[PDB]
Structure formats: C-alpha cells, structure tokens
Design a protein around this ligand. Sequence first.
Ligand SMILES: OC[C@H]1O[C@H](O[C@H]2[C@H](O)[C@@H](O)[C@@H](O)O[C@@H]2CO)[C@H](O)[C@@H](O)[C@@H]1O
Ligand SMILES: OC[C@H]1O[C@H](O[C@H]2[C@H](O)[C@@H](O)[C@@H](O)O[C@@H]2CO)[C@H](O)[C@@H](O)[C@@H]1O
Ligand SMILES: OC[C@H]1O[C@H](O[C@H]2[C@H](O)[C@@H](O)[C@@H](O)O[C@@H]2CO)[C@H](O)[C@@H](O)[C@@H]1O
Ligand SMILES: OC[C@H]1O[C@H](O[C@H]2[C@H](O)[C@@H](O)[C@@H](O)O[C@@H]2CO)[C@H](O)[C@@H](O)[C@@H]1O
Ligand SMILES: [Ca+2]
Length: 516
Amino acid sequence: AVNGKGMNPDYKAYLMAPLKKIPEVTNWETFENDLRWAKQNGFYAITVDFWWGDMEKNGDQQFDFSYAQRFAQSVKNAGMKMIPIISTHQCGGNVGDDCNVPIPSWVWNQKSDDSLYFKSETGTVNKETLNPLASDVIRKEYGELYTAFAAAMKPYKDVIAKIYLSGGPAGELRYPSYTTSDGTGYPSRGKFQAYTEFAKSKFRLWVLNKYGSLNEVNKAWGTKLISELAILPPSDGEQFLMNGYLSMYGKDYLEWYQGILENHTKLIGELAHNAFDTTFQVPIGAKIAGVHWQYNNPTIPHGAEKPAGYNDYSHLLDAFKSAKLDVTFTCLEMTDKGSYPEYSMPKTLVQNIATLANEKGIVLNGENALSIGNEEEYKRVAEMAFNYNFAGFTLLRYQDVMYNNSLMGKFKDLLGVTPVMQTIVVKNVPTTIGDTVYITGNRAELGSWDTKQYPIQLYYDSHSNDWRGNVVLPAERNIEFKAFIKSKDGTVKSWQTIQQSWNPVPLKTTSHTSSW
Ligand SMILES: OC[C@H]1O[C@H](O[C@H]2[C@H](O)[C@@H](O)[C@@H](O)O[C@@H]2CO)[C@H](O)[C@@H](O)[C@@H]1O
Ligand SMILES: OC[C@H]1O[C@H](O[C@H]2[C@H](O)[C@@H](O)[C@@H](O)O[C@@H]2CO)[C@H](O)[C@@H](O)[C@@H]1O
Ligand SMILES: OC[C@H]1O[C@H](O[C@H]2[C@H](O)[C@@H](O)[C@@H](O)O[C@@H]2CO)[C@H](O)[C@@H](O)[C@@H]1O
Ligand SMILES: OC[C@H]1O[C@H](O[C@H]2[C@H](O)[C@@H](O)[C@@H](O)O[C@@H]2CO)[C@H](O)[C@@H](O)[C@@H]1O
Ligand SMILES: [Ca+2]
C-alpha cells in the first residue's frame, strides 16, 4: 500500500439492500437465505435505507418503525449485521433509483418563506431534502427522528454495526446541483443552489458579519456596490466558474457556500451522537459524492464540484473530524479520462480524498457509483481499497451479485476478504548500507507488482540478520510475491531469486520464511 504499509486490518465488505422494502422484492424467508449466502462470500453487513417518508408519513411525531424492526429481526435470524441509513432524503430521481419515497409532505408546511427548499441559478425548485440553511427545522425534526429511532431499535442494538446519516440528496452531503429538471445532469456543469430569498439574505448577513459594513465589503472585494441589497450570489454561474471564482468575492462566496455544508455536518453529527452513543456505541458516518466530471475542464475548472458544494476538500473533511463522523466516498470503480466533453477524473479524485483522509486520521470507507457487471471493475475497486487504507467497501447493489453466481464468486475472491496478520521473513538478502527491502505481489493487497508507490516495507533484524515484517494479508487466498531491494535513491537494485507463494494464506497467524 501507499507509504510502505499494507491493507487496513479492519477492512470489511458491506452489501447495499434494495431501495424498495424487501416484501416488494421477495419474501422474508428467501431474504434470510440470501443473507446467509452473502455472509459465506465475505460480506459482514447489509446497509439499508429507512426512509423518513415511511417512518413519519402521517404527521409530526406520528412514527412507524414496524418495517425497520421487521427488517432487523430477519437480519438477526440470518446471523448477519446491519447498517441503517436514516434517509431523510427522497428516494427517486437520482441515478439508479427505482423507488418513489419523498420526505413527509407535512414538513413543508412548517415555514411560510422559502427557507426549506433549494432554488437554482435559473429558478428550478428542488425539494429532495431540507435546505441545510434551515438549521432550526433540521435541529427539531432530525433530533426527534433520531431519538425516536434509537428508542424503537434498542432491542436490536446487537445487530447494528454502524449508523449512516443522510446529509443531503441521495444521502450525500452536497447541494442538488446536478438534476434533470435543472438541466445540470451529468456531464454538464452544475448550477449553484442558493437563490431562494432566504439564501440570498443569509449570504448577505454573513458577508456583513465578516466585514461589518458595506464600505469594508467594497474595500475587501475591490468593488463599488451601491447598497447592501447589491450583495448577492453569482448572477451568471458560468462566468463565475470561468474566472469570477479567482476574485476576493469569489473566495468569500464559495467559503460561505461550502460553509453551510460544514455547519450542517457538525449539527447532524451532534444530534446523532447525542441520540445513539449511549444506546448503540457504534461508529456514525456520512457520505460525500464523487463529482468527477468537469474536473479538468479548462473553461470551467471543477465546474461540477463547486456548485455541488465542494471547493476545498481539506476544509470539508476537517468538519467530519470535528463532528466525529467517519467518511464514505461513493465512487471508486472508475478510471481517469480527462478528455472533452466530460473531463472526468474519478481516480485522481479518489486518490486526493483518500490522501487527505489518512493524513487527518479519518476512517475512510468507499462504494462503487454504478452497478458492476464485469470483473475488471472489481479489480479497480480492489486497487483503491487495499492500497489507500479503506476500512470498508460497500457494494451497490443487492441484486447484482445475489442473482449472478459468477459475479458473486469474483467478488468473494477479490473483495470479500478477511484480513489476517502474517509474518514474512526473507533470509540471505545481499543488502548494503542504505538499502531497504520490500515485497510486492500479484494481488491488490500486495500492490499488484508495483515497486513505485505500493510496495510493502520490511524491517531488518540485526540479531538474525534477515528482513521481516508483520503484513496484513487476505486469508484463504492464493498469493505470489517476491522481495526486492531498493537503494537509498529509490531505484530497484535486484529481486529475490525465486518467486514465492502461499497457497493459500492461512487463516491463523504464522510465518512464511524464504531465502533470497
Ligand atoms: O455580491 C456582489 C456581486 O456579486 C456577483 O458578481 C460577481 C460575479 O458573480 C463574479 O463572477 C465576479 O465577476 O465578481 C462579481 C462581483 O465583483 C453578482 O453577479 C452581482 O449581482 C453582485 O452585485
Ligand atoms: O449523487 C449521485 C451520484 O452522482 C454521481 O454519479 C454519476 C456517475 O458517476 C456518472 O457515471 C453518471 O451516471 O452520472 C451520475 C450522476 O447522476 C457520483 O459519481 C456519485 O458519487 C453519486 O453517488
Ligand atoms: O442505498 C444507498 C443510496 O443509494 C443511492 O445513492 C447512491 C448512488 O446511487 C451511488 O452513486 C452511491 O455510490 O452513492 C449514493 C449514496 O451511497 C440512492 O440514490 C440513495 O437514495 C440511497 O440512499
Ligand atoms: O511486471 C510484474 C512482474 O513482476 C515480477 O517480475 C520481476 C522479476 O521477478 C524480476 O526478477 C525482474 O525480472 O523484474 C521483473 C519486473 O519486470 C514478478 O516476478 C512477475 O511475476 C510479474 O509479472
Ligand atoms: Ca417530528
């Protein structure tokens, strides 16, 4: 893995449940058998959306957790674990959605203004989720939902491995900047989503709070605004993305815009911890979308990310660390293209996010963005997951592998692995002053024969004069590997004589000793 390390010893594979309720897909008996099958193939738990639209449909405080309880009961029967997603967003309208579950219709009547929803540059209204700007409503509604959910699911605390919060559309912390109705669907540029009167007034107040008066604003932005009412979001999103973002005004606008999502992260994180920490004592997470298109567009750099709310990932992740939430990046199975017209750079994006997450010490999880129908994609996922320290991978979605034995078998082999610590020992290595010994092998957990970025470092044992190290390997999988010497300058000086193998790696910790 990166930095001479190996895969994450806590790695676990998860499976996404269908978007619809199980009884709308199959029966509970078959579902339970499917879970036993998933477990046999390396899956630790199943993640599942519990829709706000289902749990508090009739009215405020009129809860119904009967489906969640019945679902948990079957997970318990199958001897599996589950990861509930408290989905306070609408099901339907997003890529892959095969459902129709809007959030409670009554929630929209708690306000007379336009503080609750989103409005784009061109006026498109979006109601897939509550606008994070309305923190007072979010505090009340999510607070009540989380606490009621916690009380009703207490009897199943033993089958809950983690809890996911929904930070926005599709359960991701972002703005609904790419939708069909707004004409911003992939691979188009996104449109900013802060044009409701409430949003305009909030940005205005934020600007005035920062500088104090209009004169100080004009002096900081180098503008000549005639009055406070002239302080507004970008009138032309495209021109803003072309060069307006480089100005002092642009930096402030994007700081505020992304700032709303950061404050939202801290709010829901606090509500969730206060509601679940004592009862469940399990990790809590949130998701960030992989907006990979228009990444390297020369005319509008990061033209899809900025409108989605992603301007500074480092600053964004600091909000997660502060709120004590683990992060999940929802797009790992893709490769870079970076050509007109998509200017898509998914892999580079994943690498950047993973690097930042590891530096900050934030637990990182991943998912595939679209259904995988080919083994080649599993390999891509494996390379990223096992070389960038991911603690977990969630496969979208249920049916893809449950009804395809060959695919399920390939997932078991490549991703449904149980990590086990093993000791690798290499003797008679002709190292000289300044050399370091590494190992690399055929599988992704071994760096896939890469000697540049992914090799695993070994340590010299001055007492027995050999090189050794405790490395995390995939139990019960066949591996081939070789040790090699790396000079002080970084060049590969020589390789181990014979290629080593472990067929397969044992499930119990032991050691593999070989000679140069
Ligand atoms: O709030 C001030 C001003 O902001 C916007 O104009 C920006 C523009 O969006 C940027 O791309 C760049 O050109 O700087 C401008 C301000 O100097 C709004 O379009 C405008 O209505 C508003 O007054
Ligand atoms: O927020 C939903 C979803 O959006 C993006 O998925 C893209 C996908 O990568 C493209 O290949 C194409 O299908 O358009 C989709 C958007 O509608 C993000 O990549 C993903 O992380 C996110 O879950
Ligand atoms: O069941 C989880 C989640 O799935 C869908 O959103 C996905 C999207 O399809 C993929 O790109 C994935 O990688 O990221 C998103 C979140 O995991 C549904 O649209 C969403 O409502 C649902 O919660
Ligand atoms: O390119 C991947 C390749 O890596 C290893 O081959 C080494 C070989 O072991 C060395 O003796 C020397 O020839 O450099 C090669 C790298 O090009 C693996 O042994 C091999 O199986 C694998 O395909
Ligand atoms: Ca309520």
